[PDB]
Design a protein around this ligand. Structure first.
Ligand SMILES: OC[C@H]1O[C@H](O[C@H]2[C@H](O)[C@@H](O)[C@H](O)O[C@@H]2CO)[C@H](O)[C@@H](O)[C@@H]1O
Ligand SMILES: OC[C@H]1O[C@H](O[C@H]2[C@H](O)[C@@H](O)[C@H](O)O[C@@H]2CO)[C@H](O)[C@@H](O)[C@@H]1O
Ligand SMILES: OC[C@H]1O[C@H](O[C@H]2[C@H](O)[C@@H](O)[C@H](O)O[C@@H]2CO)[C@H](O)[C@@H](O)[C@@H]1O
Ligand SMILES: OC[C@H]1O[C@H](O[C@H]2[C@H](O)[C@@H](O)[C@H](O)O[C@@H]2CO)[C@H](O)[C@@H](O)[C@@H]1O
Ligand SMILES: OC[C@H]1O[C@H](O[C@H]2[C@H](O)[C@@H](O)[C@H](O)O[C@@H]2CO)[C@H](O)[C@@H](O)[C@@H]1O
Ligand SMILES: OC[C@H]1O[C@H](OC[C@H]2O[C@H](O)[C@@H](O)[C@@H]2O)[C@@H](O)[C@@H]1O
Ligand code: BXY
Ligand code: BXY
Ligand code: CA
Lengths: 168, 532, 27, 84, 97
């Protein structure tokens, strides 16, 4: 989203022209565009809530203290509805903590949900990559939480059920 | 891999269709009546064993602890400025990169039924580590705010200055106790560590203060020939070890406790039998196995740890070069703040070793305490090599021992102790140089804590760059030092005891405070530049 | 004699608190 | 047995337990005021003499031994037991 | 011997330029030399690693000994000080490559 503020346009102006020159013949310099917009912005807190299970990256945590991460049941997890994440480079380099190889949630969500990016903006620091917000929608939405038939059974010290599987 | 059971077919379901997957229910356990019995009985049994050891010096004779219960607590101009920095940082300053991970881990901890590592290792637990995560989980119930959650960490920093200034420094010797520069360097280096490395939910603050408490308990139980304080130290050391993996620095404080334990046990043995004085300390050792294994079984923990190593990032004793190679990166791990802390503690340690070699110990120093502070620092630095991950934010373990070495280094470099002016000049040149080398990075903090801070991604420079100016001053000091080597200069004829001269003979306090200020100024000026 | 009142409780509780802790994970 | 032997004996235990020079060990100076000796230091100095020399000062003799001179008076008055 | 073929200009001009163009690392980039020594490569080979570390251990114990006693016992005062002196200076003078 190419951004600029309403304050940068005087009250004198009332009509707008989207001009965009280009002159590089090289194969990869190029431009794409959409019609202008004055976005109907509502702060993250009022949008996501603190009752909705979210996939808070290990990085974004003390920053989003209100929003609740998905609790984990009895081997099963609460399906996250949103994903708050650090800046481009911050996720590019720190997201592999949760990858399938590592056995993290980013590997469980990689199979269950489809990630749609919702556009986000920083308070007054318009041009700063604060991070990113994602809406997580299931592939089979007709499907709802499992029928967990769980029961009590005491087990010994040295006891091991099955081996822990290493990812590739 | 199961994320459920998906069918694009609908309508009535026929007989035959039966999917019966047994979920990996391990780690989701609660103690058996028998396991809870041996715990409550065994932990009370240890207090009963240690209560029996408490009466053994009271049986050998002597008046109750004369300085070890409570030293007269008060304020000082320095005590204010320390706590000013501590409290201001709590609001304006940068936090650790992991406090989010730990928070969200503790947040989901209760419903889970165990302390699972939420973001990795296929939900396997923290197994021996993160007992205070359970305590942070309880604390979240009140509120979840950087200011609330980091508040025990604020109190720890305060508790830390307290321990250094009132328990450590008075014990360190007459010159340590009497020198104000020794208290200024102690605060200066301690804050240079505490502020950038310990502002968060990581175990470093708990360990940094834990290593001081272990030391104090031995140090005070060695002077009183009482074995209970040596046993108390063991418990503090055992708890800090399993604080986080970075807990092994506590082995520094622990191994050093062996020497005085054989001294206390052999001098106060008074034909009591080895079994009578050692069984309660053997209980004091094992007493953390009640905490570590409070919810998880031996197999569970062992199997999980051997997996967590196999799967995730695990490194070797010989990989510790990485930790230092990271420290020299133009990055948030190689930040001016972080370079300076380590580099200066190494200089403090070096001048302390060097002095303890030339003279028997640091001139105005108490023999045993000083040697044991250098001891714990040497052992700690080596012990660190065994951590599975090599980050610089682990240097925050040294926060306690930094204060203690600040005191020692200052005392070792004073006019009275270090008698050669030329030698005091080269030492200064070294302090200028570690700072020259420290200003050869970015004043960068990591994550959201890097917002609009001065030189957050550049070399702090005014007109030529701090690194170049400091290196020039560092070479300038050497020429002055080289001039004294040929001129033959003493403490009295170089200049007549003025305030500017007074300051210059305490270069660590100058350099350390300079940086404490710079870091608080930088993160205030960060908030300032992020106006609305 | 020779203050054996604490001497016996230190041995019997010191060995038991150790033994129980070593047993604790195996339970 | 001499004052110098007792003073030099306590002087080395003072520079071992505290950072206080042996020159500062004179009969005039009082530990808690003139020398600035801690309550813990005293216990260590006392437990070191109990190890090194086999002499113990139990019933708050440390409180009675204000100056270093007062200590000379104590251990000189012990030579009656003939342990040498 | 140095300016036998080229002038002050020629040499001075080339040097500042080779510093701009090519790989030029400052005195503070000396950590890299060591960072490189612990790489799993021919630069950090069992041969290069051993050489440096053993020289450092030899020089450590020498400084250590000269600090405890006045000099290393059975040795001459001046010549022994001068060997150590050159080693320390050389390691630092190294940072300027
Ligand atoms: O890899 C980092 C994590 O490892 C820890 O477990 C250690 C464990 O301490 C040790 O006994 C075993 O030998 O190896 C692993 C090495 O990873 C925990 O898994 C985590 O808490 C550490 O961050
Ligand atoms: O590559 C050789 C092996 O390195 C490690 O061995 C270390 C171990 O990790 C270390 O923490 C411990 O003290 O013992 C050895 C000493 O090298 C790995 O354990 C092995 O997997 C490697 O094969
Ligand atoms: O190249 C941009 C950097 O320069 C500025 O440096 C300022 C400094 O922040 C401030 O204390 C004062 O105005 O002088 C220097 C320049 O002389 C920014 O502070 C840096 O953040 C910028 O990265
Ligand atoms: O030999 C190169 C000289 O330049 C260095 O300084 C660099 C460095 O990047 C930094 O101090 C400053 O901000 O910019 C300059 C120009 O790159 C050294 O300080 C010189 O002494 C070096 O020798
Ligand atoms: O880049 C490595 C090469 O640089 C040198 O160039 C030096 C120059 O000769 C020196 O006098 C000047 O002060 O700095 C530059 C490099 O910073 C050598 O010419 C090359 O042969 C070196 O290998
Ligand atoms: O026990 C501490 C807890 O925090 C760790 O997070 C580690 C992060 O630090 C580095 O900078 C990143 O690469 C890494 O994700 C967990 O490993 C651990 O359980
Ligand atoms: O070697 C004795 C030294 O003490 C002072 O440290 C030093 O200056 C003097 O040379
Ligand atoms: O001398 C080279 C100079 O280049 C930069 O101007 C300054 O940082 C450095 O001193
Ligand atoms: Ca184009």
């Amino acid at each position: 989203n190419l951004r600029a503020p309403l304050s940068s346009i005087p009250p004198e102006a009332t009509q707008i022209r989207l001009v965009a020159s280009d002159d590089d013949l090289a194969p990869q310099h190029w431009i794409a565009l959409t019609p202008p917009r004055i976005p109907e912005l509502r702060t993250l807190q009022e949008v996501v809530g603190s009752s909705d299970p979210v996939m808070l990256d290990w990085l974004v945590g003390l920053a989003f203290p209100c929003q609740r991460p998905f609790d984990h049941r009895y081997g099963v997890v609460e399906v996250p509805k949103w994903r708050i994440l650090p800046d481009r480079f911050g996720a590019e380099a720190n997201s592999p903590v949760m990858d399938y190889l590592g056995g993290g949630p980013l590997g469980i969500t990689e199979l269950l949900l489809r990630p749609s990016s919702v556009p986000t903006y920083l308070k007054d620091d318009w041009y700063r990559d604060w991070g990113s917000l994602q809406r997580l929608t299931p592939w089979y939405p007709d499907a709802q939480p499992a029928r967990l038939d769980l029961g009590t059974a005491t087990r010994s010290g040295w006891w091991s059920p099955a081996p822990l599987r290493l990812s590739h | 891999q199961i994320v459920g059971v998906f069918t694009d077919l609908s309508g009535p379901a026929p007989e035959g269709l039966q999917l019966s997957a047994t979920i990996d229910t391990r780690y989701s356990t609660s103690p058996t009546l028998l396991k809870l019995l041996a715990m409550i009985v065994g932990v009370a049994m240890t207090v009963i064993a240690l209560g029996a050891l408490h009466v053994l010096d009271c049986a050998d004779g002597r008046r109750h602890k004369r300085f070890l219960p409570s030293r007269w607590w008060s304020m000082t101009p320095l005590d204010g400025l320390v706590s000013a920095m501590l409290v201001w940082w709590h609001f304006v300053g940068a936090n650790t990169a992991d406090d989010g991970y730990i928070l969200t881990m503790a947040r989901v901890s209760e419903h889970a039924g165990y302390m699972a590592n939420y973001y990795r290792w296929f939900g396997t637990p923290e197994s021996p580590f993160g007992w205070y995560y359970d305590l942070l989980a309880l604390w979240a119930h009140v509120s979840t705010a950087s200011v609330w959650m980091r508040f025990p960490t604020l109190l720890m920093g305060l508790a830390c200055w307290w321990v250094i200034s009132r328990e450590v420094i008075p014990r360190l010797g007459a010159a340590a106790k009497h020198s104000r520069a020794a208290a200024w360097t102690a605060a200066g280096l301690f804050l240079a560590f505490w502020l950038p490395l310990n502002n968060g939910l990581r175990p470093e603050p708990i360990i940094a203060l834990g290593i001081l408490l272990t030391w104090c308990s031995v140090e005070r139980g060695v002077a009183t020939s009482r074995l209970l304080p040596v046993a108390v130290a063991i418990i503090i050391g055992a708890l800090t070890l399993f604080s986080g993996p970075t807990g092994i620095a506590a082995v520094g404080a622990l191994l050093v406790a062996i020497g005085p334990l054989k001294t206390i046990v052999a001098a106060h043995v008074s034909r009591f039998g080895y079994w009578a004085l050692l069984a309660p300390i053997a209980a004091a050792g094992t007493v953390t196995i009640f905490l570590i294994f409070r919810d998880q079984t031996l197999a569970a923990e062992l199997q999980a740890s051997s997996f967590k190593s196999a799967v995730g990032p695990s490194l070797a004793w010989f990989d510790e070069h990485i930790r230092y190679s990271r420290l020299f990166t133009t990055s948030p791990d190689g930040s001016v703040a972080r370079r300076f802390a380590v580099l200066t503690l190494l200089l403090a340690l070096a001048v302390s070793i060097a002095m303890t070699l030339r003279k028997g110990r640091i001139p105005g120093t108490a023999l045993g305490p000083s040697r044991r502070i250098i001891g714990i620092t040497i052992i700690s630095f080596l012990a660190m090599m065994f951590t599975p991950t090599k980050w610089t934010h682990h240097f925050g373990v040294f926060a306690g021992l930094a204060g203690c070495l600040g005191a020692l280094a200052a005392v070792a470099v004073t006019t009275t102790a270090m008698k050669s002016r030329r030698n005091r000049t080269v030492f200064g040149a070294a302090v200028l140089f570690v700072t020259a080398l420290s200003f050869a990075t970015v004043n960068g903090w990591w994550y959201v804590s890097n917002f609009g801070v001065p030189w957050s991604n550049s070399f702090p420079e005014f007109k030529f760059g701090f690194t170049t100016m400091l290196l020039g001053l560092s070479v300038l000091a050497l020429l002055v030092a080289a001039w004294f080597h040929f001129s033959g200069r003493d403490v009295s004829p170089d200049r007549p005891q003025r305030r500017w001269q007074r300051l210059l003979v305490a270069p660590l306090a100058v350099a350390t405070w300079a940086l404490v200020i710079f870091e608080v100024v930088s993160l205030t000026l960060g908030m300032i530049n992020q106006y609305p | 004699s020779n203050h054996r009142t604490a001497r016996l409780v230190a041995i019997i509780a010191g060995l038991l608190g150790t033994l129980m802790a070593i047993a604790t994970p195996l339970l | 047995a001499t004052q110098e032997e007792i003073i030099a004996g306590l002087a080395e235990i003072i520079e071992e337990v505290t950072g206080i020079e042996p020159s500062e060990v004179t009969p005039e100076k009082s530990f808690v005021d003139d020398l600035d000796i801690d309550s813990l230091s005293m216990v260590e100095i006392a437990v070191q003499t109990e190890d090194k020399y086999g002499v113990k000062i139990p019933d708050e003799d440390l409180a009675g031994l204000r100056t270093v001179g007062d200590v000379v008076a104590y251990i000189q008055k012990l030579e009656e037991e003939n342990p040498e």
